[PDB]
Design a protein around this ligand. Structure first.
Ligand SMILES: C=C[C@@H](NC(=O)[C@H](CS)NC(=O)CCC[C@H](N)C(=O)O)C(=O)O
Ligand SMILES: [Fe+2]
Length: 329
């Protein structure tokens, strides 16, 4: 039988305020978690996650096959050549159970300079029809900003944890340019459950999604209360307990690049569970030209061999790489 992973619950509320010592104590907990399994739960985050789950459920349960084609990314709909990242990722009954809706920075409009330059990784969100999904766009855009706010607080924790000034990451994470994404994932109950949608691990464990590191600086995740995630540690894969009041946080491979692997991007996977459930990640990405200098907090002089890498280059190589390893989602 499988061990439970150490995933501490960290009260992050001090990261929103001005008590500096209290913030350092939070930063210490982030450091410890980041250097152990690489996961923690942010609690006292201030987000209304009951409404987030409720409104997401309404959307997933009421969207029709026709609307899905109309919002489809280009992998499902060749008419939609500008939609690499944003839109609907369809299920395929009998083959692929998971389906999702991805959106980016709401400030990415036709008049934003990056959209006018056609810079890669930037797109204008697509939305379903307002009368069919009343309030959904407004809710989802407001959600993007609420989780942006949590994520900025978190990034102040990570900076402090690494011995830097608090805005070290947060100042490259800006409303005007962030490449961050929200994905509203539906994992359905199905019987019979399509076997092609289940993968078997080297240890026999049935999976919905195989082992990987995240393409992110950090990932800020809300999930329903159904246990599914596993993290690889030196002792094997361990179960991450559910907590549908908190956000599950981990570093992605950009953080590992910046810190010369002092904060690793923890390898994790998703168990197959036959139950209706939701997974709503926010992938904290910086702007296309952010190029933080890699450093190394193990070393007295803090210096690293690694070459700077622009977030945009990282993200474009990274998103195409995760689709070829683990399949189209
Ligand atoms: C967060 C956990 C979740 N996994 C996933 O969604 C997997 C790996 S984290 N991720 C993806 O497909 C990356 C797409 C990122 C998004 N379209 C974007 O353009 O930025 C799961 O529950 O399967
Ligand atoms: Fe992941």
């Amino acid at each position: 039988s499988v061990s439970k992973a150490n995933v501490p619950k960290i009260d992050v509320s001090p990261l929103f305020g001005d008590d500096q010592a209290a913030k350092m104590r939070v930063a210490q907990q982030i450091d410890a978690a980041s250097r152990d399994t690489g996961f923690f739960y942010a609690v006292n985050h201030g987000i209304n996650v009951q409404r987030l789950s409720q409104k997401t459920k309404e959307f997933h349960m009421s969207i029709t096959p026709e609307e899905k084609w109309d919002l489809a990314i280009r992998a499902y709909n060749k008419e939609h050549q500008d939609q690499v990242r944003a839109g609907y990722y369809l299920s395929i009954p009998g083959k692929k159970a998971v389906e999702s809706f991805c959106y980016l920075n709401p400030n990415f409009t036709p008049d934003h300079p990056r959209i006018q330059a056609k810079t890669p990784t930037h797109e204008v969100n697509v939305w379903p029809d307002e009368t069919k999904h009343p309030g959904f766009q407004d809710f989802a855009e407001q959600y993007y900003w609420d989780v942006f706010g949590l994520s900025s607080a978190l990034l102040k924790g990570y900076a402090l944890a690494l011995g830097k000034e608090e805005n070290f990451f947060a100042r490259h994470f800006k409303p005007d340019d962030t490449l961050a994404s929200v994905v509203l994932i539906r994992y359905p109950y199905l019987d019979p459950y399509p076997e092609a949608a289940i993968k078997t691990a080297a240890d026999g464990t049935k999976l919905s999604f195989e082992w990987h590191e995240d393409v992110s600086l950090i990932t800020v995740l809300y999930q329903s209360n159904v246990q599914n995630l596993q993290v690889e540690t030196a002792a094997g894969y361990q179960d991450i307990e559910a907590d549908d009041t908190g956000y599950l946080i981990n570093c992605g491979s950009y953080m590992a690049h910046l810190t010369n692997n002092y904060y690793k991007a923890p390898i994790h996977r998703v168990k197959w569970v036959n139950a209706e459930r939701q997974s709503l990640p926010f992938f904290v990405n910086l702007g296309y030209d952010s190029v933080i200098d890699p450093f190394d907090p193990r070393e007295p002089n803090g210096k690293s061999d690694r070459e700077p890498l622009s977030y945009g280059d990282y993200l474009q190589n990274g998103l195409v790489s995760l689709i070829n390893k683990n399949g189209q989602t």
